[PDB]
Swiss-Prot record:
The record marks 385 as: Transition state stabilizer. The record marks 600-601 as: Cleavage. The keyword Membrane applies. This is Aminopeptidase N. The full length protein appears to be cleaved into a 120 kDa precursor. This precursor is then proteolytically cleaved at the N-terminus generating a 96 kDa form which is further processed at the C-terminus into 68 kDa and 35 kDa forms that remain associated. Zn(2+) binds at residues 301, 305, 324. It is an enzyme of class 3 (hydrolase). It is found in: Cytoplasm. May have an additional translation initiation. Translation initiation at the first Met codon would generate a form that contains the signal peptide, enters the endomembrane system, and ultimately reaches the food vacuole. Initiation of translation at an internal Met codon would result in a form that lacks the signal peptide, thereby re-directing the protein to the cytosol. A nuclear localization signal would then lead to nuclear import. Its cofactor is Zn(2+). The keyword Cell division does not apply. Heterodimer of the p68 form and the p35 form which are derived from the p120 precursor. It comes from the Eukaryota.
Amino acid sequence: PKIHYRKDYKPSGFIINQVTLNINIHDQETIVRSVLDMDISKHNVGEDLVFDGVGLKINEISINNKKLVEGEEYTYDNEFLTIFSKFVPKSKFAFSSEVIIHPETNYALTGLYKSKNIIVSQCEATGFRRITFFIDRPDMMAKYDVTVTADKEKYPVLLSNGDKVNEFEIPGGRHGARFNDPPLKPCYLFAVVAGDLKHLSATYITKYTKKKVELYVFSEEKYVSKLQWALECLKKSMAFDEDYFGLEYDLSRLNLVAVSDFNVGAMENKGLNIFNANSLLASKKNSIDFSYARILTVVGHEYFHQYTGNRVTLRDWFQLTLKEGLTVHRENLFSEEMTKTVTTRLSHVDLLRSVQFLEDSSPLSHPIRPESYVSMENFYTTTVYDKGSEVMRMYLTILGEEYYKKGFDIYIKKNDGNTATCEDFNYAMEQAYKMKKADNSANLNQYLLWFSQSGTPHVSFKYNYDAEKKQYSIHVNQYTKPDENQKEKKPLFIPISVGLINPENGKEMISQTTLELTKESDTFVFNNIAVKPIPSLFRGFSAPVYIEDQLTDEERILLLKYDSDAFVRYNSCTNIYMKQILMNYNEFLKAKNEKLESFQLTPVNAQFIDAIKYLLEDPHADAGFKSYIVSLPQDRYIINFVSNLDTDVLADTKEYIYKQIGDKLNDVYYKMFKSLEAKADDLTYFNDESHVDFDQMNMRTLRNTLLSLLSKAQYPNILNEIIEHSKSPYPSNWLTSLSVSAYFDKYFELYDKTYKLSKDDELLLQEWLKTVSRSDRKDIYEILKKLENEVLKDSKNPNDIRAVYLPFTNNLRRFHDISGKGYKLIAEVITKTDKFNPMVATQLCEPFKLWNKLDTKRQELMLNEMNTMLQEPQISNNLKEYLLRLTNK
Ligand SMILES: CC(C)C[C@H](NC(=O)[C@@H](O)[C@H](N)Cc1ccccc1)C(=O)O
Ligand SMILES: [Mg+2]
Ligand SMILES: [Mg+2]
Ligand SMILES: [Mg+2]
Ligand SMILES: [Mg+2]
Ligand SMILES: [Zn+2]
């Protein structure tokens, strides 16, 4: 297993200037003819010409139209084609090959593959080498001339990058299309699509150049009607990049294509973006609300790559966060502007502090720019994406909008036609920083540590107020725990967005202030502070850190009620919950350990419960925000604060806290559930495909959250409400009715009802599967067996497999059954999947990421399953690397 190191980057001894491809798709095989117009680079030292080429069947290879002989002139080991240096020309030459590949049986969904009746490619990161020979790395920029031929009846629509310059008939019912893409691109941005695709189309006229852009969105015939929202999202994305960044689309056409079998959400192939159907297709009748936000995000994200990824590309894969982190940041800005709801930012924070913080405190912890990799397919992590995005967002927080935009424009203008590194971006931002600070001595050298240092910083506070002096002091400390990547951690440049709230009237006491913490600790003093304030810290979640506010619950309640910042209010609530959780957890644990016949639990703070009620009864307050306040922190957030987490004890802890709050608030919950119905379930625009109301969907979120709380509580006659909810036209509602009926004898009645409603839409059926998988059923293991036998069967569709198994892994009480049967189940699924799709197999390992954080027995059980998986003779390099790193081998 070859380990690739960041420090080892060297430019290639070769140049590829032109790629000329002929892709001939037949019934049982695809023939790929390729001519590479090549040259020797200034870095050449007379080395062998080595091409990446994985799983290719060689018919012939040639140099300058002279056929090469195997053994004497070249060797091929199914991974690398080595042409011995003595046979390699010293000037410009043509390398040519004809290879056979088999998309029909390509179940790994990388390279060229078949998804139902569509032939499609996926080349990022190292997939192009599965199509034809190449020096398969992003710094190898080339021009592409691509011809695709296929049966006309089966594959009437042929697509690749660039302009379609010819279409022709071929004897035997075949046809071809030629595509020429003159601008240079890395091979990971190559794509081809062939199928019986239907489309919706629109024309977009750019803001400044006034260029007409053809927008096409494609799917199989059955689902073409579900493409309208994606089209709207694309227009919105183009508009936002123009309006916020002054960036226009540079090409004549943009194609988006939905496929059923896809390893991730989507891929930004230049002018030919390819999507998991679940991230492009939606309808109000056949999609849950989440689909709308999801499509907006994914279409936006892949569109924003056109500049940050496509036009400015990566020098090497270690720079991944430069395109992924930056593009997530760009999508976040976009979505915040489109949705106009505080929940957009809140949801991103919620994900980071649960999923990413877990990763960063696990054996898998890495910086956003890792120092090494074995498998690129394992590199696309929440750290690279989500911490990367927070690192990119901090530049905006530090600089402000005006100077951030200046620095971003500097980055684009300077790097537009070329590859780039993280230092290039930091450099552009530093120029803006120099201009903002009004001195050319200012730098961001310390900021680079955000790229190189792994682990989550802990930021803690102490306060002082002198009433006589009207002087307030905030003393701040930062600390990152040593880990496997750095023994010595260094202080980071941490921007702390702060406000000061007057506890007497809830008013702001100071103007917008961002404290720049650049040392291990610092004291920030404020004069003319008339009364002792309550500090509002890390507004907007201004740095990706553990915040230790050292506030009392009284102070936190005041922020929750009266602060201006959504995040600080949300976080204050989070902190109140966390203090309660830790206390009750310890109480339950002590009782368990000591085998106590009786014991006491600390009740939930009554003024906190009053504050929740206050917020819930406020008409001005955001419905999405309300759904967060009535929900305890994510289990994966909680686990970062507990050693040897006993999952049964945590389940008991949550149960107690919810019961405590419900015992006081259930009547309020019910009243709200009923009063929200009219606006939440409004059908006025149900048949308007383009009318999307994020506030209304948040209202449904709140309703469904409250229904869940009331169902768990066995609120009197709530089954009546559940049954009526099942009759709603909105899948978010009727699928909720299924999940919440888990606590009632009518579960299987609704199981059958909702299955019938879901079965005839591929994506809706997958949503139903997720809903069943996540159902709080005592017989969940029996239900999963039913799903396997009756619905899933031997599907190799990643969406199907992920839907059945992943939501179940969030069942705290059942997945972590002390017998280890949950761990055994998922391990079996991972191993089975690894046989045909190593990438998805590694995704299915997610539950195991917290293995060393659990109680000693569950640690042992999880480790056993991981060692068992590692012992499988046929284990992929993908899965092996991941599990070796996770188990600290
Ligand atoms: C972040 C989300 C909006 C979408 C996300 N997609 C991406 O980030 C794409 O731009 C990625 N460039 C696609 C990708 C992901 C993993 C491995 C190879 C290729 C995905 O999950 O597919
Ligand atoms: Mg093969
Ligand atoms: Mg406009
Ligand atoms: Mg988001
Ligand atoms: Mg299917
Ligand atoms: Zn991306």
